[PDB]
């Protein structure tokens, strides 16, 4: 088919000529995705490496490990390499620290080396003899000549004075000449000590200790913390990495969009306590300084907090006595520190005054080897005297490290400071309360000062239950701020990451829940068993693989379809508007009649809507690739997906093309239907994806839903990279989901196909032009019988006929639109047998409506309409040139059809009506409405196309038929009357009009006996004379007589006229306002009850929106309710929990494993119904083994792999592409776990003798991928078993009896002494036993599960309890359960819940406002409908001033708004929506609802003036109101949430700026009501309560007052928006190129009501009986004068407006003067839907009262009881005009301005209307006519006037006016008549060829000479018949504006 090319070219021409929709459709979606590009740039993707978190020691695993662990893991570091904790045997990570390295260097060189054994003897020598001390050493010394003392054998002295030739003289005794033992070879462990101090352990002293030694505190606290970590922690890789857990999606609204988030109620200051009075100082310094205001707030409950137990029963006291294991040893530590107070005074006694200190001073000569000390300088740092060093520098003397100064003083100061700090602790934390209700109030009291840890309430035990049940159950009641919420157990939004923030998500560790829980369970276990065998807990979080968390992935999954829909919404609207407009102009019917099929039209529309769509999609894909938003998916499959979406939406537009007939309405409605069809994808995405049937084709019947599913799959793929590559486009992609991206696109294409097919099916049957439901396919033209018509080849055969009397059906049969067959209508020599071909190519037609496109130029209109049935384009140029030459419109070749003149449009349509060489042509009213000059132009065009064509024109103008062409054909409901020329059909007589009565009538009677005065009208006289056998006396002798006698008689005019064709055609066939507002109210009531698309659509749609809002708000559960969780591992779904059995050599560990995995099951599910009341436990115990995977799994791991990386790693490809999880290969973690077994529900894996980390971190991606199906609530099928076994590598070697060694050191001293040190040392072995635990167990927990670390503590402690008990009391009955029940919230805690609820309240308030705003939009639509379509100024002139009109419209608006308000309040009254139905709150709500309309309707009213389309105003107002309300509520709500100078602006806009808007007032009213209700509910169960009476006069009352004042001021504004006479003359001189003494007479001038001289200086007025016709050319449209005279509108004063309505000028009295001149409303102002009562409403404006007459007054009309009962919108073309002109004359007004009194009416009705007009002018009621048809202005206008170029030209009666500005027709050889017309008559004109029907016009008054030669001498000139007619008034009018 070739029509597709031309149709596509036409569509492209329209698209290019629009130039406004094309540019925006191409540019604006790019701008929309620029938002996505900006969001991608702003929101980055977080990428991070592998994590291996260290251990988290528990209080049951010693004090030292737990304390150093809580100090080390303050950040919970992420470590790439696995920590030593994950290893099977070793469990302590802190063996790389400086202290650990020092302790490893020691205990190796010194203790564990067989070198100190010898020195032990010297150490234990002591040799401290108490009796042989204290200056008691004297000996007799009787030895002589020898020593060991001094010889005493001499007569002079012994040793001193006898040192010369005598006895002993020196240390060695000698009588002749003067002169055990060695400890450790005089050196002991010298080289060992030197080596030990020369190790890297010097870094402990000379590198890191030196900053601490200098001053108290080296520098800022960060460096001190780092130094302490280096000493204690010693973590590798420096400071550990962090994940920062960037996920706020769990509440925390203040920190996301409210700016800075305020903390909790911070304490004021240290307001006294029982502490040291120094601890208060540091507490104040920490809780007031912002640096530590956060850390101390999270540390005060632990150091200074209380734990409360409810039962107070002896069992509870016994349990807690076994639970204070850590505190009873922290007290021991504190006592040990405090023992310094007594030790120090005795240690310092060794320097000031001590005998021991003197020994080293006295040992310098020979004791302790030689003079050198350290074995004669054994080491470089050794030796020196040491008597002037840190060893001693005298008891008191004045140096870098001399004496015990700089060591003892600093040590004492540090120890005293440590004792003071440690005294700032509370260890009697356990407080004994009862009944569990004092617990809650005391916790509430303590939480103000943060001195409250928790409360351990025990269910089901009375205060008198000394014994302990086999199943001991207990609860922990934490504060909700520092405990995980118990209402949600999962994150509810899976984000790739380990969820390991130090402070944001580990509320179970730093909050103290886990520590207290473990202490309580340890107490319970040790009370129920009491068999020692201590086993702690070393909770270790599961490793996490390297991940790339992209925060943008949340977007583009719920925002990409939003943007796509909002991007093609305007294209959808524009294309639907174009399609509907192509049918509204009745142009699709024209195309179908021309020959092109419907399928071709659909195909070309698809091509037009697809070319621009493809261009836009190409631009969008280029932008997306350039925007770096979809970087990995594909460059091309995205383009294919968008093309599929485009064709789907084009098919949907084709579907929505139906159900519509108006372009604007369809354009407005499609733009919202296309989004409503996209809503249920959002509905399924929001809390509905979990409930899926694996085949969403049923719900994806809408294309946007399919696009949403496809983009969801694209998002889910983009996380792993390669989103939509061809390799995995479909074939069960996305973790084996049945629904596929490829399948989704294919079914969307099928959806487009079915939409197109259904659109075809509907369009074949829905339009009213034609239909066929359920088709179930399986001499040129002449008519002998069809009745007898033979259209001649060169005649304009006017096919006249009455409406519905064969004038339409016969044409429809002949044109082939409805071929009846069985006839002899041989059109052009061809029959009906084949009318599709060779007929339409030469049967160009023209319907009544125009067939010109709005936007095509005339240079292309004829081109398209000639090539539609043409073949080539070269001939098309010649045809266009010929058509332009004929039409004479060559100058206006580039002007579009819309810009063409009104009269030129019809001329062009007739020109293109028959252009493809149409031999036979059909015309339907070629000149229905045109200017007479344009009528003559189009007639000249038609007469130039008669060379070979046989044009057939069916005109309702009988006057036009006689002048268009010969051979008229009138059909009188059957057959043919007479197919002859009008001259031969006129005589199927001659009426001469002569314009005193007695003198005028005397001439007619005297000179003729058959002369009769037909009508003696005013200023007229119509004389009737016979036509047949009239001789010469009655032919023109009267004209000779009238001309002979014309000076005496006035007349001044004369003429002869023939019989008009109109006759021939018919021959064949106050106290007034109260009664006006009532009428307007009745009209409104009738209109609103006779329209189901305006009343119900405005009282139900808001109700539906409010119901949807209520449904959305109700389903939201309360946010402030926190239930209690049983805290067992089965709270989640089916899961894998592993099982490592390490340290097999311990029988206790073997029995623990056996009673963990086999006998009582994994967990707590006892033999009785416990720990799982609703979870039954089955009996499977399969003990299976995984089958081999010989693909590569049984082979790749079958090679030799060392201890390192036993698995073949996996691809952490986060280098060039962000793949999030590594997506590890088939190797994964290696061989599968040896067994899978389940007892209750969970699969158990025996990870024994197998690497745990290499499996846990590597098989996790596979499990999560297999489990991730919705990404909302996904169970990763694993949370972490517990690894039985593991020894704490560091254990105190000394153990017990260390005090005995310490006592021996203090034995020879006062180092022993003091009451405090005895108390500290009496129970030291228990302290050392509890310092660390030898055998220990590890626990693995997945922190992504919220309640996992707690639950696995519970299962581990249950196992420990079941293992420690002896070989009796079977463990199947023994268990412990914890229940986390947080405390009830406080004011500040519930403030967040109040804000969260107020958010939903504001959302529902916005929905209610948007729903309620529709009614004012409907009122505006009605106002525009009755404004632009007239009937506005019609009611103005016929009614009271606009003030009362607007008042009654306001009253009706209130009446129609009250019902909707009642519906809304009645849908709120059900279910008690947010307690809006309360007796105190309901009046406020109903008042707000009622007053919102009163306040917003006056703002809706002015929108009528701005908007002219009565359909675009609805959307442009609803969207505007929605935007205003949303903006107002958002500004007034989100800004209300931190004193950052925005609160002043917020208050200003709340008080003065935004208070004006009623939408803001209603929003504030509902928001404040919701807040008040929430506060009342909060205070209800707190016992406070308050009144909070509505109408606060400052909170919600101000909104009501604002609405009340706004309604009045805006009504005044609407009234204001709706809100000269120099000289005049009575003289009339326009007749030749003095008062008012007549009825309905005017004596005034006139001036234009504009800035240009439109109508100035008009005539005076009209006589009582005078139908003054205000005619004129289209240049002077008379609108500027008609509007000024009546109807107001453009009735501005201008320069000199002085015209009056016969009683007063139209200055300051137009309203009073408007009661005399009812306009005829040439715009067909029947804008209502009232039947038989529309005239009842229009009959108002009665002088005093007509209520008893209005029934009969409506009866007087133009033949009532015909269409009166029919609906006003169901009237025919002329019926509405007849009704309008009947209304225009109801009160017999003196002056009537009948503008276009009839239009498109059959002559049978035009004659009746003219009869009514003459009847009403007979009495004296003047009328005014301005119709373009000269037939009406000649048969009705007694006087006539024509205005040209802005001024009138001529006046007077029609006959006298035509005389200043008589054609004889003869019917027969033109030889004798031509000679007679040139020999007898000197003047003549053309003879109109020799067609035997010639028309002769004489330019002279010698009518007498045309009688004898014409009638009497007819045979002399061979004339069969003759007739004389004067020139038509149309010639005179054309002559003026020629
Ligand atoms: C768990 O063990 C700790 C170990 O101390 C208990 O701590 C309590 O500590 C306070 C102060 O250190 C003791 O108060 C003292 O009472 C004596 C009189 O008995 C008085 O003379 C002192 O001046 C001081 O006020 C308190 O006695 C002590 N508790 C016990 C039971 O001895 C903690 O109470 C233990 N918890 C449980 C639940 O048993
Ligand atoms: C805090 O909330 C708890 C919820 O369990 C309240 O305890 C019960 O609250 C309900 C109301 O929903 C009452 O009907 C019960 O009587 C309460 N229990 C008891 C034993 O009285 C608790 O009262 C609340 N505390 C407050 C509001 O201070
Ligand atoms: C911890 O374990 C042993 C204990 O001596 C030793 O290899 C070293 O101190 C540490 N090993 C590490 C950190 O790999
Ligand atoms: C400790 O240091 C102080 C401060 O200089 C000093 O006065 C004192 O002598 C030193 N030695 C002591 C207190 O034994
Ligand atoms: C121990 O202290 C007491 C009193 O403080 C004192 O008398 C005694 O001498 C001291 N010990 C020695 C060895 O001096």
Numbering used by the authors: 4 to 151, 158 to 188, 271 to 489, 494 to 873, 929 to 936, 949 to 1150, 1154 to 1160, 1204 to 1277, ...
Give verbatim excerpts from the published study on this entry.
The cryo-EM map of substrate-free ABCA4 produced a final reconstruction with an overall “gold standard” resolution of 3.6 Å. ABCA4 exhibits a highly elongated shape with a length of 230 Å, a width of 85 Å, and domain organization as previously reported for other ABCA transporters. TMD1 and TMD2, each consisting of six transmembrane segments (TM), display an outward-facing conformation as found for ABCA1. Density corresponding to a lipid is lodged between TM1/2/11 at the level of the cytoplasmic leaflet of the membrane. This feature, also found in the ABCA1 structure, most likely represents a structural lipid important for stabilizing the protein. An elongated tunnel or cavity accessible to the intradiscal space and lined with hydrophobic residues is found extending through the central and lid regions. In our structure, we resolved five disulfide bonds, three within ECD1 (C54-C81, C75-C324, C370-C519), one in ECD2 (C1488-C1502) and one connecting ECD1 with ECD2 (C641-C1490) as inferred from an earlier biochemical study. Eight asparagine residues post-translationally modified with N-linked glycosylation are evident with four in ECD1 (N98, N415, N444, N504) and four in ECD2 (N1469, N1529, N1588, N1662) in agreement with earlier biochemical techniques. As observed in Type V ABC transporters, the NBDs are closely positioned opposite each other in a head-to-tail configuration. The substrate-free structure determined here is highly similar to that described in this recent study although different detergents were employed in the purification of the protein.
ABCA4 is an ATP-binding cassette (ABC) transporter that flips N-retinylidene-phosphatidylethanolamine (N-Ret-PE) from the lumen to the cytoplasmic leaflet of photoreceptor membranes. Human ABCA4 is a 2273 amino acid full transporter organized in two nonidentical tandem halves with each half containing a transmembrane domain (TMD) consisting of six membrane-spanning segments, a nucleotide-binding domain (NBD), and a large glycosylated exocytoplasmic domain (ECD) between the first and second membrane-spanning segments. Unlike other ABCA transporters and other characterized eukaryotic ABC transporters that function as exporters, ABCA4 is an importer translocating either the all-trans or 11-cis isomers of N-Ret-PE from the lumen to the cytoplasmic leaflet of disc membranes. The importance of this transport activity is evident by the finding that over 1200 mutations in the gene encoding ABCA4 are known to cause Stargardt disease (STGD1), an autosomal recessive macular degenerative disease characterized by severe loss in central vision, degeneration of photoreceptors and underlying retinal pigment epithelial cells, and the accumulation of lipofuscin deposits containing di-retinoid compounds.
